[PDB]
Amino acid sequence: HGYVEKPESEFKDKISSEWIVQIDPQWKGDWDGAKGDEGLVALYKELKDSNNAKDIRTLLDSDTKLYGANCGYTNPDATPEDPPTDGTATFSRGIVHAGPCEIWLDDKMVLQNDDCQSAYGDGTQETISVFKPVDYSSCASGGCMFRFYWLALQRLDGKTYWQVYKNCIPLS
């Protein structure tokens, strides 16, 4: 759960920290047989390779009925805001689910990791997750759309689920 807080996510309607969808894994594999967070991540990395996938955006953007609405619950129509000046993005809390995440500035993939839980925080909810480094130089011209993608790999009584989080924030 959570949303990007810097830059500040905006909502048209209700504020929500929830995933946009929560579905069965769509890449065929032995998801249920993986040993814990490290197992889910390791399997993800293995399936990423054999599906020939360079990033999660391509997958998550390919079908909004299966992978959820563009921008999730966030509002791309919001008043654009100034990019951060410190080369970071900040989540609204600590990431406590394993899985890959990505930041794009328009068509430029500026940050990517197979397990953002370990890369950008300490796995506790208390420690704010800080996405860094982020180069916002491509935005200084005429702005950009900041897009955040996160695929959390989750378990409920032995069964693995994919949770999809999407945020969009316009920058000037």
Please report, in range form, the residues annotated as the binding site for Cu(2+): 1, 97, 157, 165
The strand pairing partners of 21, in sequence order, are 164
When asked if residue 158 is in the footprint of a copy of itself (CB under 8 A), the reply is yes
Sole residue written with tokens 């894994």 = 25
Nearer Cβ to a copy of itself, position 31 or 146? 31
Q: Which does 156 bind (CB under 5 to 8 A by kind): a copy of itself, Cu ion, none?
A: a copy of itself
* Strands in 3-87 per DSSP E: 4-6, 21-23
Element (H, E) at 32: none
The window from 51-59, 67-75, 78-86, 156-164 that contacts a copy of itself (CB under 8 A) reads 156-164
Pattern of binders to a copy of itself over 20-49, x per CB under 8 A? Answer: --x---------------------------
When asked if residue 14 is in the footprint of a copy of itself (CB under 8 A), the reply is no
What are the Cα distances from residue 164, in Å, to 3, 33, 146, 171? Answer: 12, 21, 17, 23
| Residues 114, 48: Cα–Cα separation, whole Å | 10
